[PDB]
């Protein structure tokens, strides 16, 4: 019925981002309801398809030999539905690396098994996707405070391994969130909290940072912004919808051939920031991509 039902999902409106709410308990009227998915389609294939359909509407940088890393790519199924959708979406030849605490079979070019903190690389990335979630987050015994764990790693990975012009999509929920990650969203040309229409009944959202600028463009208080996110979800019921899954004609990410340049931090002027902010520039070397997984040696 709602017009947003034909969209892949709903982004947090700007006026909700400008509030100064106190954190409330999340209470969705349709909480737990399951979407009606096309025959034989997995929930995570539908979820990643809607996330990619939404990323298609942003100013993403899409260089030749694009580099994408996907954290939390495994599943209790032992397969990687999200990685299969990203590889379908990304231009052919895109280097796709995925990772998970648990072993799984993947379509990625390379897969690293182990805690995300064991993943190393001197290379910079054009796009970071995280679907990580700590199962213990379900154990709500205290006040809903900012979480560390893998979020500390993701914040450092963005600050040290994301190319200027690059983008991120990090999964959060009412209880799975980090204040420093929201603050980092202020270091991008644009940002939002995106809710897939197939998971409208969940507090889940993808925090999207569009075009990394390597410096703060706006100051964001993470504690206030998560409260603003929950207030938005609590007062704006979203109808479950799988409508956007039926039209895949324009699904593939447009190969923009975005320019890739190597610039010193002292060469990042307003003219360069303008190019980064439009998805027309990626700043990083174009050396071979090398990744490693730390192995703890014990008796």
């Amino acid at each position: 019925a709602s017009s947003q039902a034909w969209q892949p999902g709903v982004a947090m409106p700007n006026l909700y981002k400008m509030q100064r709410m106190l954190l409330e308990k999340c209470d969705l009227q349709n909480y737990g309801d399951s979407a009606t998915l096309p025959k034989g389609i997995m929930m995570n294939v539908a979820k990643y398809t809607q996330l990619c359909q939404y990323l298609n509407t942003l100013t993403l940088a899409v260089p030749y030999n694009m580099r994408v890393i996907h954290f939390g790519a495994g599943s209790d199924k032992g397969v990687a539905p999200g990685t299969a959708v990203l590889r379908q979406w990304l231009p052919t030849g895109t280097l796709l690396v995925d990772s998970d605490l648990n072993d799984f079979v993947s379509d990625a070019d390379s897969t690293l098994i182990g805690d995300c903190a064991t993943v190393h690389t001197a290379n910079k990335w054009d796009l970071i996707i995280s679907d990580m979630y700590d199962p213990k987050t379900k154990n709500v015994t205290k006040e809903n405070d900012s979480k560390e764990g893998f979020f500390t790693y993701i914040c450092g990975f963005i600050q040290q391994k994301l190319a200027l012009g690059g983008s991120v999509a990090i999964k959060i929920t009412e209880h799975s969130w980090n204040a420093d990650l929201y603050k980092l969203m202020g270091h991008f040309a644009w940002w939002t909290a995106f809710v897939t229409n197939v998971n409208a009944s969940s507090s889940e959202a993808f925090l999207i940072g569009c075009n990394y600028l390597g410096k703060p463009r706006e100051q964001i208080d993470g504690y206030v912004m998560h409260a603003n996110y929950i207030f938005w979800r609590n007062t704006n019921p979203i109808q479950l919808s799988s409508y956007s899954l039926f039209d895949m004609s324009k699904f593939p990410l447009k190969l923009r051939g975005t320019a890739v340049m190597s610039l010193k931090e002292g060469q990042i002027n307003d003219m360069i920031l303008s190019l980064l902010s439009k998805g027309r520039l990626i700043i990083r070397e174009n050396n071979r991509v090398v990744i490693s997984s730390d192995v703890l040696v014990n008796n």
């Binding site: 997995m42 294939v45 299969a84 079979v105 895949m248």
Partner: protein, 123 residues
């Protein structure tokens, strides 16, 4: 390797074993990742992107590979997988068992269609 490969050839016969498993009423391998697609593709067997036609379903390749799913070495040279990182088109009538279909069928090296399910080079 001689005595190790001699044994593997005898006992490790996944293709035959899975075929016998289904004959004994074994439930087909599940969680093959079916992709959303237009269903107006070329219809070739294994492709870089989903190419299912109106009579096919496209799946993530690694999830339809018996060797990947069972974590056993691949028979292909240098353990090279033909499905991992690709999309496999499965006839809708056989989409209930993609692993079984990829095992029991072979691709035509000329048109890229499944032999007996799209390949018409013998006309």
């Amino acid at each position: 390797n001689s005595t190790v490969l001699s044994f593997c050839a005898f006992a490790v016969d996944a293709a035959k074993a899975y075929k016998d498993y289904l004959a004994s009423g074994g439930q087909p391998i599940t969680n093959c990742v079916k992709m959303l697609c237009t269903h107006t593709g070329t219809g070739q067997a294994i492709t870089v992107t989903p190419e299912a036609n109106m009579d096919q379903e496209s799946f993530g390749g690694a999830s339809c590979c018996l060797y990947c799913r069972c974590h056993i070495d691949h028979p292909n040279p240098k353990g090279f997988c033909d499905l991992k990182g690709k999309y496999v088109q499965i006839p809708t009538t056989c989409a209930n068992d993609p692993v079984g279909f990829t095992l029991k069928n072979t691709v035509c090296t000329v048109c890229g269609m499944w032999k007996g399910y799209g390949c018409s080079c013998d006309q």
